[PDB]
Design an enzyme around this catalytic site. Structure first.
Site, PDB file in Angstrom:
ATOM      1  N   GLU A  35       0.879  -1.033   0.143  1.00 45.67           N
ATOM      2  CA  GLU A  35      -0.173  -0.062   0.201  1.00 45.67           C
ATOM      3  C   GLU A  35       1.048   1.399   0.014  1.00 45.67           C
ATOM      4  OE1 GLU A  35      -3.054   0.277  -0.708  1.00 45.67           O
ATOM      5  OE2 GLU A  35      -4.117  -1.813  -0.005  1.00 45.67           O
ATOM      6  N   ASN A  46      -7.745   8.697  -6.028  1.00 46.30           N
ATOM      7  CA  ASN A  46      -8.593   7.787  -6.856  1.00 46.30           C
ATOM      8  C   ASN A  46      -9.401   8.472  -7.554  1.00 46.30           C
ATOM      9  OD1 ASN A  46      -9.099   6.447  -3.401  1.00 46.30           O
ATOM     10  ND2 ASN A  46      -7.618   5.668  -5.072  1.00 46.30           N
ATOM     11  N   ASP A  48     -12.598   8.504  -8.151  1.00 47.78           N
ATOM     12  CA  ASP A  48     -13.966   8.930  -7.723  1.00 47.78           C
ATOM     13  C   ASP A  48     -13.652  10.102  -6.965  1.00 47.78           C
ATOM     14  OD1 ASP A  48     -12.867   7.985  -5.311  1.00 47.78           O
ATOM     15  OD2 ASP A  48     -14.643   6.844  -4.743  1.00 47.78           O
ATOM     16  N   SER A  50     -12.130  10.337  -4.066  1.00 45.55           N
ATOM     17  CA  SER A  50     -11.593  10.111  -2.530  1.00 45.55           C
ATOM     18  C   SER A  50     -10.088  10.080  -2.557  1.00 45.55           C
ATOM     19  CB  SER A  50     -11.998   8.928  -2.222  1.00 45.55           C
ATOM     20  OG  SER A  50     -11.708   7.728  -3.018  1.00 45.55           O
ATOM     21  N   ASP A  52      -6.534   7.746  -0.491  1.00 44.58           N
ATOM     22  CA  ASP A  52      -6.117   7.038   0.418  1.00 44.58           C
ATOM     23  C   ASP A  52      -5.005   7.555   1.092  1.00 44.58           C
ATOM     24  OD1 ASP A  52      -7.844   5.128  -0.738  1.00 44.58           O
ATOM     25  OD2 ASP A  52      -6.497   5.021  -2.340  1.00 44.58           O
ATOM     26  N   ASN A  59      -9.165   4.817   3.189  1.00 42.09           N
ATOM     27  CA  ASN A  59      -9.726   5.809   2.034  1.00 42.09           C
ATOM     28  C   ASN A  59     -10.736   6.765   2.565  1.00 42.09           C
ATOM     29  OD1 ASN A  59     -12.493   5.733  -0.253  1.00 42.09           O
ATOM     30  ND2 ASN A  59     -10.234   5.918  -0.844  1.00 42.09           N
ATOM     31  N   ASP A 101     -15.518  -5.149   9.214  1.00 44.17           N
ATOM     32  CA  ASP A 101     -16.702  -4.804   8.654  1.00 44.17           C
ATOM     33  C   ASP A 101     -17.221  -6.036   7.844  1.00 44.17           C
ATOM     34  OD1 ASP A 101     -15.171  -2.686   5.995  1.00 44.17           O
ATOM     35  OD2 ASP A 101     -15.620  -4.795   6.004  1.00 44.17           O
TER      36      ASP A 101
END
Ligand SMILES: [Cl-]
Ligand SMILES: [Cl-]
Ligand SMILES: [Cl-]
Ligand SMILES: [Cl-]
Ligand code: NA
Length: 129
Positions: A35, A46, A48, A50, A52, A59, A101
């Site tokens: 990462e 990203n 979209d 967003s 990270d 994110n 999650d």
């Protein structure tokens, strides 16, 4: 801060990630390697909109607030900047919520693509832990 491999393993164990939700320490070190290359200041935008953040590339769509991800949530209740600290506490505490999650470490696409099903223990081998 750019951590060393064994230095990061020890910090993650310190903060209770070793075997958290059944994921051995090597999984977490491997994920961090791919990462962020162990760099707490890593960021990546990203498509979209967003972003990270940090050593586990958490994110802003769901997990932290950066003020510039429309419609997003802040489920870890932190500013995304806290994920860039040399102290990994905020990243670890947020990672514990992410991995709980439902999808486990598959939440990290790079873990699925580059760590899952490999000899992840190699990432902590040799380290005094
Ligand atoms: Cl391991
Ligand atoms: Cl936002
Ligand atoms: Cl730390
Ligand atoms: Cl799982
Ligand atoms: Na957010």
């Amino acid at each position: 801060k750019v951590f060393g491999r064994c230095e990061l393993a020890a910090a993650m164990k310190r903060h209770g990630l070793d075997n958290y939700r059944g994921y051995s320490l090597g999984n977490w070190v491997c994920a961090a390697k791919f990462e962020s290359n162990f760099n707490t200041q890593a960021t990546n935008r990203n498509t979209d909109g967003s972003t990270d953040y940090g050593i586990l590339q958490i994110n802003s769509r769901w997990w932290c607030n950066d003020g510039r991800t429309p419609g997003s949530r802040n489920l870890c209740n932190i500013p995304c900047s806290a994920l860039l600290s040399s102290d990994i506490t905020a990243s670890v505490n947020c990672a514990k919520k992410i991995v709980s999650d439902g999808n486990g470490m598959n939440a990290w696409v790079a873990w699925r693509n580059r760590c899952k099903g490999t000899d992840v223990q190699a990432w902590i081998r040799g380290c005094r832990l």
